[PDB]
């Protein structure tokens, strides 16, 4: 009753698993044509509710052959033998049903690590599972019996499973995206009477940050119930015979049901191509040029310049005073060259999560590699790259998490078409140990903005703020030197505030506004 | 074949052969050969295949029973199944080489604090092996991943003690095994297998197998015309490698470096020549000279001189077997294993008995003693096991078999380390490594610049005059960045480089090598003696 | 504790100590470290107490800066006889030289006199290191030479410096004069 279309988006991995499952069954002769073992154990992983079970049931529809859903904890009965022998019966039927496929849900419950599994029944049944799997290799069984799987957490798995012939195809499925958000919205609302419009749905999806499939199902259902509630609150003597059809969902339903939603968006990994651009803040052309060189050339130019191949470095640290729109520039380059941006800010990392910090680091790096043409990032990494030793209560974790970070990055060759950008404003703070060359070498200083950047940003503001023409930009230029982009836009904000505070219905930022703004502001350049 | 395994293959060949390749009545002459070995490491690479192959090379029954396929639901049936297999092994000993191969003993061995029946299982198989000791040709090979995963009670002398690791995924073996795998696969002809190899750091063989697998998989998927002969292109290979999971994880630097990549402090060079390599000629030198060899030397210089380079150049200029000891290699998440890998590398030194062992940046290897008074106990445990094991001594008294490894360390915070390390008898020599003088700066600039595109305008001596308080890496990065400026800015596609860019780059890299820090370093670690 | 137990068990025996000042850094300096130190010293006194039980079971110790100890060991009865080890005289230096030459093939340009002259303010083992380094220098002259040249010896003498100033001997003899019993 759930075709593949019904599955919320992610069509890519859908087609992937589609062929990867059907064609083995169809012609094992194609695998054997190129001397290939028939892949036995597939496994998907991602945060819960994402579609694990939905994918399960939908393929169970689309198959055309046998499927035997086996929910995980249901087999957990402390009576020995029952679990393993029940599996045995499953596999015997699997044999008789030769063209088929077996799936296991919440497999993490079955395979907790010996450090996690405080029961050894787990270990022995894992053993029996391994026996089973390897036993599937019967030549008559080949190409006909096949294995599926999905977890809540691939980390909570066991090493004994991804071994060859047992589990190789580890497909990732997680947080959807903008187009995917809109897609899953449309798919959900496929069969609901709604008072929604196109652009309304667009902006609504835009307001969605972290939601998941079944979560959005909850959302739209609660909006519908809010609409029904409004209807029956207009007149309370209406049985459902006169209400089951008229009720439809406007935006207000969505907002109301939305503000009471925590869409499991507390700690995720967003592949979020931002909206920033060079045009957003220009100038400093030489800096962006040298940077795009250091990041992009090592694939093209030092290739054509291996001639004098001194070294194409990888780790860049291009930083000057604070507040000079740095991270803005980071995102800017990242989106302009066309790479999938990531981010790990030092402060947002300032957590007591022993290992789990490094865990997030490793997972982020792995996602990066998975989207390999891309740019990892760090902001104010000196937050946990503090001067070593001075913090005995917070740096003791810092040294070891930095060492782990090393352990990952130190794939200078794993860093092929993958760069790194930490951030700070005090070069003395940085540790030259992390600069013993090989990993993080090239350095730029991003100095204070200039008159050119000043008039640039002011043009931007007057393009974004209705201003009086009598305030010539050159006056500011004559008095805005030794300022900063952040400080300057604050200046413009304050001038606007003055304009609205004198007259609450004004429409032109006059000279006195900028004057008293200057009086209220200053080049805080200590 | 045994791709990328033949060296461990032949070592284990001789080891397990000793009781089997040669008869028993000599053992009956009052000798009890060890029986029962351990193959620890990621399997599928050939561990099974290699034990097969060696039982072949000698001629033996490949009884490749999978012990994980013997789990039982009720206590007692398991023991009878083990009776079956071990008794068949006993009749094999009655006939010839009973090369019983039993894999995954650790799953048959959940360590202490676990349930009861593990006790019955382990004690019963112990009865089996201790009884079959009487029989003539009984040998077993427990095949697992990590020895720590096994039963402790199964690591005694006269028990599973002869343990060897699976092949570490070396470059050479990496290439060997890639070729061995594809020896039955229709990969494309043109293959820069070395490139893919060096991409595949830490990837064990089986990983490489799987990688090639999915590579050819997508090859067959996104191609349909030549249904039988695939030109499995290196592009799909690359993209698959990209897709694949990173590796799960004593790495000797294969990179050789001579005395040319390094200049300055040639005094310290001759010192290292004095107290390290002349010992090679030693078996006759001290004879006509007297003086013994100093056990341990400690070279200290300011962090930034890349002393590691000098150590590796030394290891180059001697041909002696070399292994490195680093904290990043050391700081694994297993507490109590640091001492273990220490012992392991020292045992390897004993193995390749002419051995030079390097202890880099030991302040990182051994942190502070009593700065953080809540998590610094296992560090003192490593301290103790070190102070113990560091006692490599021999007869060395007035022909000679020079079976004596040497240990050399270097760091940047000796005032942090435990003072007992410097014991006369453990570390009986310490040497200073000042940052280069004007002349050393000049020379190291010259030699670091001998491959960058030089222009006819530069004058290295001026930089030398002004590039004071510059580490080696300082000058190297400096000439690097200046080359970059020149090339990009003027010659987007350039030929030459100007010194002006070095002058400008001066401030770009702030040299914080304050002479007061130099004096502090020197006074501290000269009174460190 | 087990040390003293075995000592008793093998009664005709001699306990030895060295570098007593190590454990004898006074408490209060290191708040969490000198605790085991004072516990150990207290138990040491507690062991030695069996002086009668120590039926002719002598205790020999030696250190460098005897002041740094607690007088709980230098209180009368337990450790009272004291001796400063005098620096080696000329004859002792020559004997050191004999014991050195008896293990290395040396040349004939040797001259014990000015060697002993330019080896004052040094310690014996240091002078052993001096002749050792001179042998190293001759080895630098040729990897297969035979006899070390005393010019290279003088070179080594120049290289080696006495890191022990006479002020240390002044302090030694002052303490000697201003202490308890010697015999």
């Amino acid at each position: 009753k759930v075709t593949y279309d019904m599955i919320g988006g992610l069509s890519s991995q859908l087609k992937a698993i589609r062929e990867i499952i059907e064609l083995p069954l169809k012609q094992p002769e194609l695998f054997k044509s190129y001397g290939i073992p028939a892949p036995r154990g597939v496994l998907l992983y991602g945060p819960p509710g994402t579609g694990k079970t939905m994918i399960a049931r939908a393929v169970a529809n689309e198959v055309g052959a046998y499927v035997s859903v086996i929910n995980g904890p249901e087999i957990i009965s402390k009576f020995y033998g029952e679990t393993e022998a029940k599996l045995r019966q499953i596999f015997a039927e699997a044999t008789l049903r030769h063209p088929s496929i077996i799936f296991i849900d919440e497999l993490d419950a079955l395979c907790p690590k010996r450090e996690g599994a405080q029961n050894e029944v787990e270990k022995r049944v894992v053993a029996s599972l391994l026996t089973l799997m390897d036993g599937i290799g019967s030549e008559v069984s080949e190409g006909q019996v096949l294995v599926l799987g999905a977890t809540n957490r691939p980390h909570a798995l066991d090493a004994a499973l991804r071994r060859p012939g047992r589990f190789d195809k580890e497909i990732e499925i997680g947080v959807p995206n903008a187009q995917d958000r809109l897609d899953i919205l449309q798919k959900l609302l496929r069969r609901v009477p709604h008072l929604l419009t196109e652009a309304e749905l667009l902006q609504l999806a835009n307001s969605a940050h972290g939601y998941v499939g079944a979560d959005l199902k909850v959302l739209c259902n609660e909006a519908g119930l809010c609409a029904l509630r409004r209807i029956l609150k207009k007149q309370p003597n209406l049985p459902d015979v006169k209400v089951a059809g008229l009720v439809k969902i406007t935006l207000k339903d969505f907002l109301q049901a939305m503000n009471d939603i925590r869409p499991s968006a507390m700690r995720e990994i967003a592949i979020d191509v931002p909206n920033v651009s060079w045009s957003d803040i220009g100038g400093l052309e030489s800096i962006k040029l040298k940077l795009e060189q250091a990041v992009e050339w090592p694939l093209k130019h030092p290739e054509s310049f291996i001639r004098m191949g001194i070294q194409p470095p990888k780790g860049v640290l291009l930083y000057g005073p604070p507040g000079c729109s740095k991270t803005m520039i980071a995102k800017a380059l990242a989106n302009e060259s066309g790479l999938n941006f990531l981010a790990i800010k030092g402060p947002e990392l300032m957590n007591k999560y022993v290992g789990e910090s490094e865990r997030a680091v490793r997972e982020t790096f792995r996602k990066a590699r998975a989207v390999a043409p891309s740019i990892i990032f760090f902001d104010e990494l000196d937050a946990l790259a503090v001067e070593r030793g001075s913090s005995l209560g917070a740096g003791n974790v810092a040294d070891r998490v930095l060492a782990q970070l090393l352990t990952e990055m130190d794939g200078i060759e794993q860093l092929k078409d993958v760069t790194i950008l930490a951030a700070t404003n005090r070069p003395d703070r940085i540790d030259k140990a992390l600069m013993r060359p090989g990993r993080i070498d090239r350095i730029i200083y991003v100095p204070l903005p200039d008159a050119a950047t000043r008039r640039e940003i002011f043009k931007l503001q007057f393009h974004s703020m209705p201003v009086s023409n009598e305030v010539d930009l050159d006056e500011l230029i004559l008095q805005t030197d030794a300022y900063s982009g952040a400080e300057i836009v604050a200046v413009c904000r304050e001038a606007a505030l003055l304009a609205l505070e004198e007259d609450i219905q004004a429409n032109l930022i006059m000279k006195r506004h900028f004057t008293q703004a200057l009086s209220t502001v200053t080049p805080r350049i200590p | 074949p045994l791709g990328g395994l033949s060296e461990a293959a032949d070592s284990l060949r001789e080891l397990l052969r000793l009781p089997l390749r040669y008869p028993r009545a000599l053992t009956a002459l009052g000798l009890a050969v060890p029986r029962g070995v351990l193959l620890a490491g990621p399997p599928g690479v050939g561990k099974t295949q290699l034990v097969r192959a060696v039982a072949r090379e000698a001629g033996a029954e490949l009884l490749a029973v999978s012990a994980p396929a013997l789990q039982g639901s009720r206590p007692g049936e398991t023991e009878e199944n083990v009776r079956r297999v071990f008794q068949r092994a006993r009749e094999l000993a009655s006939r010839g080489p009973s090369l019983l191969f039993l894999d995954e003993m650790d799953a048959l061995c959940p360590q202490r604090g676990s349930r009861a029946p593990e006790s019955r299982v382990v004690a019963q198989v112990l009865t089996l092996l201790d009884g079959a000791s009487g029989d003539r040709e009984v040998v077993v090979v427990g095949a697992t991943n990590r020895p720590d995963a096994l039963d402790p009670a199964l690591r005694r002398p006269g028990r599973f003690d002869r343990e060897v690791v699976i092949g570490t995924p070396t470059l050479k073996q990496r290439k060997e095994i890639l070729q061995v795998i594809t020896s039955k696969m229709p990969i494309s002809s043109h293959v820069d297998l070395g490139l893919l190899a060096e991409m595949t750091v830490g990837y064990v063989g089986a990983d490489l197998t799987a990688l090639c697998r999915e590579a050819a998989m997508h090859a067959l998927l996104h191609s349909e015309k030549n249904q039988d002969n695939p030109v499995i292109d290196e592009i799909d290979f690359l993209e698959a490698f990209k897709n694949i999971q990173p590796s799960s994880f004593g790495l000797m630097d294969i990179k050789p470096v001579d005395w040319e990549e390094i200049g300055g402090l040639e005094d310290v060079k001759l010192k290292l020549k004095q107290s390290i390599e002349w010992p090679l000629k030693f078996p006759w030198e001290f004879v006509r000279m007297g003086l013994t060899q100093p056990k341990g030397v400690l070279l200290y210089g300011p962090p930034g001189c890349a002393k590691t380079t000098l150590v590796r150049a030394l290891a180059t200029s001697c041909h002696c077997s070399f292994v490195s000891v680093s904290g990043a290699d050391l700081f694994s998440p297993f507490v109590g294993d640091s001492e273990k890998v220490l012992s392991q590398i020292f045992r390897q030194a004993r193995a390749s008995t002419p051995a030079i062992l390097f202890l880099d940046e030991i302040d990182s290897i051994l942190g502070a003693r009593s700065a953080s008074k809540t998590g610094c106990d296992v560090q003192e445990r490593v301290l103790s096991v070190l102070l113990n094991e560091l006692d490599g001594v021999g007869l060395k008294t007035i022909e000679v078999f020079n079976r004596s490894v040497m240990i050399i360390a270097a760091t940047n915070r000796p005032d942090v380390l435990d003072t007992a390390l410097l014991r006369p008898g453990r570390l009986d020599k310490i040497i200073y490594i000042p940052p280069p003088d004007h002349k050393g700066r000049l020379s190291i600039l010259k030699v670091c610049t001998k491959t960058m595109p030089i222009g006819p305008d530069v004058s290295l001596e001026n930089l030398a005059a002004e590039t004071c308080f510059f580490s080696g890496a300082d000058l190297r990065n400096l000439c690097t960045e200046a080359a970059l400026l020149a090339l990009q800015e003027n010659g987007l596609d350039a030929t030459t480089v100007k010194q002006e860019h070095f002058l400008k780059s001066l401030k770009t890299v702030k040299p914080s090598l304050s002479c007061k820090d130099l004096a502090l370093y020197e006074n501290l670690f000269k009174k460190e003696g | 504790r087990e040390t003293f137990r075995k000592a008793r068990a093998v009664a005709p025996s001699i306990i030895f100590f060295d570098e007593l000042d190590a454990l004898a850094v006074e408490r209060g300096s290191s708040l969490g470290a000198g605790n085991v130190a004072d516990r150990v010293l207290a138990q040491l006194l507690t062991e030695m107490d069996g002086i009668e039980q120590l039926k002719d079971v002598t205790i020999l110790a030696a250190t460098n800066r005897p002041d740094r100890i607690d007088k709980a060991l230098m209180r009368p009865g337990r450790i009272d006889r004291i001796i400063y080890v005098p620096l080696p005289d000329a004859a002792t230096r020559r004997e050191i030289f004999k014991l050195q030459f008896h293990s290395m093939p040396v040349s004939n340009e040797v001259d014990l006199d000015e060697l002993i002259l330019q080896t004052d303010a040094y310690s014996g083992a240091e002078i052993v290191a001096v002749c050792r380094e001179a042998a190293l220098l001759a080895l630098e002259e040729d990897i297969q030479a035979n006899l070390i040249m005393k010019r290279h010896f003088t070179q080594a003498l120049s290289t080696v410096t006495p890191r022990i100033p006479e002020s240390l001997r002044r302090f030694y003899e002052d303490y000697q004069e201003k202490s308890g019993l010697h015999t």
Side-chain angles (χ1 to χ4, degrees), chain A residues 30 34-35 37 80 84 114 119-121 124 131 163 169 293 297 305 310 366 369 372 436-437 442, chain B residues 68 71 73 106 110-111 115 145 185 213-214 217 220 226-228 230 245-246 306 361 481 484 487 492:
Chain A
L30 307 183
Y34 300 170
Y80 271 49
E84 65 183 1
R114 268 176 66 156
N119 182 7
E120 278 53 37
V121 176
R124 57 211 52 160
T131 64
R163 298 167 178 166
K169 187 64 69 182
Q293 287 146 35
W297 288 32
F305 183 56
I310 304 101
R366 294 191 193 254
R369 195 166 318 183
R436 187 161 259 183
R442 196 178 205 187
Chain B
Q71 213 276 332
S73 45
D106 53 48
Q111 305 157 16
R115 274 158 172 144
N145 295 319
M185 314 305 196
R213 286 194 213 284
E214 287 184 353
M217 184 279 292
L220 170 57
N226 58 272
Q227 310 161 349
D228 313 328
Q245 186 71 254
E361 302 183 36
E481 182 79 31
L484 311 176
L487 300 151
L492 181 43

Side-chain angles (χ1 to χ4, degrees), chain A residues 151-194:
Chain A
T151 179
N152 60 2
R153 172 94 279 193
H155 187 58
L157 271 193
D158 187 290
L161 320 170
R162 299 158 196 155
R163 298 167 178 166
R166 295 181 176 168
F167 285 112
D168 55 358
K169 187 64 69 182
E170 316 203 60
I171 288 176
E172 187 171 287
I173 282 301
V175 176
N177 306 320
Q179 284 200 11
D180 277 326
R181 275 166 278 238
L182 168 59
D183 170 86
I184 62 170
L185 284 190
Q186 301 149 334
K187 297 191 169 185
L188 264 169
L189 311 187
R190 185 175 292 171
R191 180 182 293 176
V192 56
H194 69 83

Side-chain angles (χ1 to χ4, degrees), chain C:
Chain C
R1 187 165 288 100
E2 48 203 348
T3 304
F4 276 84
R5 199 205 309 112
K6 289 206 180 59
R8 260 186 308 181
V10 176
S13 45
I14 301 166
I15 289 192
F16 172 86
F17 289 102
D18 47 349
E19 307 274 323
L20 196 55
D21 51 356
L23 61 83
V25 74
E26 271 155 300
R27 76 216 71 168
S29 43
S30 282
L31 276 299
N35 314 118
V36 286
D38 57 63
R39 292 151 193 159
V40 176
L41 191 173
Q43 188 38 67
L44 164 59
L45 296 173
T46 316
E47 289 306 274
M48 304 179 56
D49 67 345
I51 52 173
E52 156 59 42
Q53 283 75 18
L54 290 157
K55 201 174 189 177
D56 271 3
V57 194
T58 71
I59 285 177
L60 170 58
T63 300
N64 297 321
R65 275 69 174 174
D67 51 354
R68 305 180 167 189
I69 62 170
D70 176 6
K71 294 190 181 180
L73 281 293
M74 254 295 294
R75 52 133 293 178
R78 304 171 191 198
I79 310 165
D80 308 333
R81 304 265 315 288
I82 320 167
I83 295 165
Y84 160 67
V85 178
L87 273 193
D89 64 354
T92 318
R93 299 176 261 261
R94 197 169 304 196
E95 290 150 344
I96 282 289
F97 279 115
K98 297 148 194 139
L99 307 181
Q100 290 333 292
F101 312 150
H102 189 72
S103 315
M104 307 167 293
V106 304
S107 87
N108 198 2
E109 66 180 71
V110 307
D111 49 356
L112 296 172
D113 51 358
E114 56 90 15
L115 277 296
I116 297 175
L117 299 180
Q118 294 82 17
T119 196
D120 203 82
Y122 290 102
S123 159
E126 315 166 342
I127 313 153
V128 194
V130 194
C131 47
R132 185 174 184 270
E133 297 310 309
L136 165 67
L137 296 155
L139 171 43
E140 180 156 323
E141 186 80 22
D142 167 24
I143 315 298
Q144 273 313 310
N146 185 33
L147 304 186
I148 309 97
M149 296 192 171
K150 293 298 302 181
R151 41 165 169 186
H152 306 169
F153 266 91
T154 46
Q155 183 34 270
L157 296 170
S158 59
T159 63
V160 56
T161 175
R163 65 181 64 252
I164 302 176
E166 198 269 342
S167 48
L168 269 46
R169 165 195 171 280
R170 287 187 61 259
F171 163 83
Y172 281 1
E173 293 175 351
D174 175 54
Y175 190 96
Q176 184 178 2
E177 187 91 348
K178 68 182 199 71
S179 309
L181 188 153
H182 182 74
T183 59

Side-chain angles (χ1 to χ4, degrees), chain A residues 309-330:
Chain A
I310 304 101
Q311 195 56 219
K314 316 297 295 204
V316 301
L317 183 63
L318 321 183
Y319 297 105
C324 182
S325 315
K326 308 195 310 183
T327 317
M328 293 177 71
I329 300 168

